[PDB]
Structure 1
């Protein structure tokens, strides 16, 4: 009752998914029958830059690469449920891919919100089912103009406002390293696909960590650029006109060099003419390729989310190896992180009390992976306030969250917007006072159990800071959880001892062997330097 439309949308969606996967399988079986002697292990394990080179030279055909990757994608989906839709168009695009394109012949996976002609971008929401996109979004257009072959849409958590990966339409995506673990989110399908070898390169989006969480959780690299570095034209969203905390799109891949290639390919005249609102900043190769010693700011904890033992070791070990390689490591923590998270970020994202966002869920199921977010956002402003005052003496983090997700006037939004602006300049001034080039931080990990990211909201602290600040931030895998890391987690307390701390301890249990990352940060518009730094970390920690 009130879910008949919702149930119909799920039924039709699951059938579209089933039919896409069947279509993929038949295409693959057909190719393999014609090409039984093809070494697919050789092809799949090629680093993207090498694959690109052999495609450009003609040593590998676009068909060989496409169908080999398609088969692997179909196979890894069995254990992960990361693919929602096969972009059927892509065999004709495969044979029309511009030949001198920088991504010529390269299969690329897309987060479901990247609009693709003839396909739904459901976001797991019933209201977006049977609403196929009338055209490719700008970044998909540019990928195609650079010779890339977008081949799949990958799963997201319902609404994308989550760092887990389940919705009522396509269901739950699972981490390929351990099926009881979350692949992270909201680009969770991308993390799981790329992380199991089913795609050499993908695109995701990030408003609170959604490129960096699935990258870290699935053992892959990811970059969230400055928000307006790449075009968001034609991206499917669910809140419109919230500009306090901007969304950013960026690459995900198996190595840092893939991120740089993808950025280089996207930052071309095609993109700049298709979307004039994006500043025409070409990829500065000389900055990316530079090898000068760096002043590297670093912290082991943000004093908000206690790092897991694995997180702290990964950070410390990276710091140490950077110092051994000639870099100057400088203790640095951005000022007033509780403010940035509780007031600026929470208030920016929910200035209207959650009302606009909540329109999406009307008549829909609420996926269990979203926790109580929808229930909480729905509370009357006065009750958010009362409950906040009652909780403040015991659980001030919870109290501050509740108080700052209440509706407000446009006058108060201006005030908040100016505070975000002044806070950005404050941290820039702090950074300049220490003469930093870059900043090295912990990254959330290892992967949390399925359906717990929605109950561990405080753990977005490490990522969300750089959305608030709108700094480029990316993640690099540096280590895996040891027996000792995992045993030490038994003693994890957290700084607050509220429900978010309590859950995280349990959610990270049984994590031996799982990948753990560090986060690399630079100033606004310094994507190339941020990537240069990520490259250094990758050279030192996975040589």
Structure 2
């Protein structure tokens, strides 16, 4: 019953292997012609400096491209983050618009960004051997801005996961520690950028998928408001689900790179190619503002107990912000359990998971997905019964289960209205404290491979802002200390259910791993969100190369 799936995996692995061999050949050829090039100097240039040298002609696009291609090939050896080499990029390299804001910049793409002539498998057998007819809109815009998309990077099967394995290309590993997850679903991006193999990448995010891998791999990422950028041509598993919007956004080694990428994407090219996106230009004056901020903050969401490292990261950032003249205001969005258990879960699974499950018919189920598939497949009556039985002992598990049941269109309208009202509730709460931005913990350090799928509760920090559709980004601010790690041994969680128990084991042995915080602003305020992220970066990593 898996002959088709086995065939798909065999071919996918052949293509991946052939891609990597092609990259290696091209790199060797370039190095042989350019033996004196200082590759290390080039790779360590911050993106903004790299862009400046490309624009001035101090570095050639060829030098930058083949040097990054070599590094990407090398870091892939230990991470398995690359699924495909975007072959025609060497021609794009030659024709990159000279005055483009990203002229000559190699860019990595999550596998779901459609690219002409390439599959977007999402790790699913049913999508193998179905090459895209054309580049998606954001890829078109990247190219019009002179960038050179060069690889597709790995995702967990279906993308519905914050780990990163599928049965076609296998498992992506965290470059900091091979036993750890790079996070997900933009996990290949996190591993590649996090190890220096790409200066800039695009990911997508519906429950944290830009923010998890950025945090786990020690890089920066921004999830804009859902409709700030075009989703035209993004390959997905479920279509027409609009209660919880998908978002796409940049990942990079610093905040300034995110801002440049957003600025480059928010151009007339994008707005003309996809008229459904509001034509809101990047407001430079907001991004570059240096006014003191009113910063809401919380040390915990009272849902996922923060690791000791997460809490310390949050408190230290709060303290540095206060020392820098900002006003820090205790603030926690109301009714988080509702937002997660009813609104988010219900929005994602209004149909009981039937549409999602069609993708898995005849396919293997990657171990990183845990019991998700088995649970979604349960009859609605059984989900309900099991929920009732679990409720007295494990209310959180019971709540998720009950809200993953199929329902009528009538009930979906009701849910959609509740989502709208909840958004207005939190906005009103925010305005009552006159906040500018909000600082929150971000899940970390990286969990062991194959554990995100058994720690669903831990999406609480990120998924809240998908439900609310507020821009949210993450910035690395510290690393796990011996003390942080020792204190983790005493971690209990608020619920004591299997999700709390797994998280504790999954974060074992994390000394030295990166830990982030999350920065949030109101809908459409990506510029202000990035301004705040820049502040955090300046205060918590003061030696970060300009």
TM-score, length basis structure 1: 1.00
Distance (Å, rounded) in 2 between the aligned partners of 1:48 and 1:250? 17
Distance (Å, rounded) in 2 between the aligned partners of 1:453 and 1:62? 39
How big is each residue's C-alpha offset from its partner over 1:240-262, in whole Å with a ceiling of 9 and x where there is no partner? Answer: 00000000000000000000000
Distance (Å, rounded) in 1 between the aligned partners of 2:206 and 2:481? 31
Q: Unpaired runs of 5+ in structure 1?
A: none
Shift of residue 229 of structure 1? 0.1
Number of the residue aligned with 1:538: 537
Shift of residue 524 of structure 1? 0.1
Shift of residue 495 of structure 1? 0.2
Distance (Å, rounded) in 1 between the aligned partners of 2:448 and 2:67? 31
Distance (Å, rounded) in 2 between the aligned partners of 1:100 and 1:401? 50
Distance (Å, rounded) in 2 between the aligned partners of 1:429 and 1:114? 36
Number of the residue aligned with 2:47: 48
Aligned to 2:355, the other structure's residue is in SS state: helix
Shift of residue 450 of structure 1? 0.1
Shift of residue 520 of structure 1? 0.0
How big is each residue's C-alpha offset from its partner over 1:399-451, in whole Å with a ceiling of 9 and x where there is no partner? Answer: 00000000000000000000000000000000000000000000000000000
Distance (Å, rounded) in 2 between the aligned partners of 1:89 and 1:517? 36
Aligned to 1:360, the other structure's residue is in SS state: helix
1:176-191 counterparts in 2 under 5 A? 176-191=175-190
Distance (Å, rounded) in 2 between the aligned partners of 1:202 and 1:390? 45
Distance (Å, rounded) in 1 between the aligned partners of 2:397 and 2:104? 49
Distance (Å, rounded) in 1 between the aligned partners of 2:496 and 2:374? 23
Shift of residue 129 of structure 1? 0.2
Shift of residue 391 of structure 1? 0.3
How big is each residue's C-alpha offset from its partner over 1:280-325, in whole Å with a ceiling of 9 and x where there is no partner? Answer: 0000000000000000000000000000000000000000000000
Number of the residue aligned with 1:22: 21
Shift of residue 126 of structure 1? 0.1
Distance (Å, rounded) in 2 between the aligned partners of 1:417 and 1:91? 46
Number of the residue aligned with 1:64: 63
Shift of residue 508 of structure 1? 0.1
How big is each residue's C-alpha offset from its partner over 1:337-370, in whole Å with a ceiling of 9 and x where there is no partner? Answer: 0000000000000000000000000000000000
Aligned to 2:227, the other structure's residue is in SS state: coil
Number of the residue aligned with 1:489: 488
Shift of residue 395 of structure 1? 0.1
1:302-451 counterparts in 2 under 5 A? 302-451=301-450
The structure 1 segments of at least 4 consecutive aligned residues displaced by more than 6 Å after TM superposition are: none
How big is each residue's C-alpha offset from its partner over 1:458-486, in whole Å with a ceiling of 9 and x where there is no partner? Answer: 00000000000000000000000000000
Shift of residue 59 of structure 1? 0.2
How big is each residue's C-alpha offset from its partner over 1:376-401, in whole Å with a ceiling of 9 and x where there is no partner? Answer: 00000000000000000000000000
Shift of residue 279 of structure 1? 0.1
Shift of residue 142 of structure 1? 0.1
Distance (Å, rounded) in 1 between the aligned partners of 2:89 and 2:130? 20
Aligned to 1:478, the other structure's residue is in SS state: strand
Shift of residue 230 of structure 1? 0.2
Shift of residue 46 of structure 1? 0.1
How big is each residue's C-alpha offset from its partner over 1:515-537, in whole Å with a ceiling of 9 and x where there is no partner? Answer: 00000000000000000000000
Aligned to 1:151, the other structure's residue is in SS state: strand
Q: Unpaired runs of 5+ in structure 2?
A: none
Aligned to 2:226, the other structure's residue is in SS state: coil
Shift of residue 148 of structure 1? 0.1
Distance (Å, rounded) in 1 between the aligned partners of 2:515 and 2:348? 28
Distance (Å, rounded) in 2 between the aligned partners of 1:355 and 1:134? 27
Distance (Å, rounded) in 2 between the aligned partners of 1:168 and 1:89? 27
Shift of residue 512 of structure 1? 0.0
Distance (Å, rounded) in 1 between the aligned partners of 2:231 and 2:50? 28
Shift of residue 214 of structure 1? 0.1
Shift of residue 19 of structure 1? 0.1
Aligned to 1:152, the other structure's residue is in SS state: strand
How big is each residue's C-alpha offset from its partner over 1:10-52, in whole Å with a ceiling of 9 and x where there is no partner? Answer: 0000000000000000000000000000000000000000000
Aligned to 1:236, the other structure's residue is in SS state: coil
How big is each residue's C-alpha offset from its partner over 1:177-208, in whole Å with a ceiling of 9 and x where there is no partner? Answer: 00000000000000000000000000000000
TM-score, length basis structure 2: 0.99
Aligned to 1:491, the other structure's residue is in SS state: coil
Distance (Å, rounded) in 2 between the aligned partners of 1:155 and 1:416? 33
Distance (Å, rounded) in 2 between the aligned partners of 1:273 and 1:89? 25
Distance (Å, rounded) in 2 between the aligned partners of 1:203 and 1:161? 17
Aligned to 1:306, the other structure's residue is in SS state: coil
Aligned to 1:496, the other structure's residue is in SS state: coil
Number of the residue aligned with 1:135: 134
Distance (Å, rounded) in 2 between the aligned partners of 1:238 and 1:465? 21
Distance (Å, rounded) in 1 between the aligned partners of 2:136 and 2:42? 29
Aligned to 2:31, the other structure's residue is in SS state: helix
Distance (Å, rounded) in 1 between the aligned partners of 2:530 and 2:183? 22
Compute the RMSD of aligned alpha carbons: 0.4
Shift of residue 153 of structure 1? 0.1
Distance (Å, rounded) in 1 between the aligned partners of 2:254 and 2:247? 20
How big is each residue's C-alpha offset from its partner over 1:105-163, in whole Å with a ceiling of 9 and x where there is no partner? Answer: 00000000000000000000000000000000000000000000000000000000000
Distance (Å, rounded) in 2 between the aligned partners of 1:153 and 1:169? 14
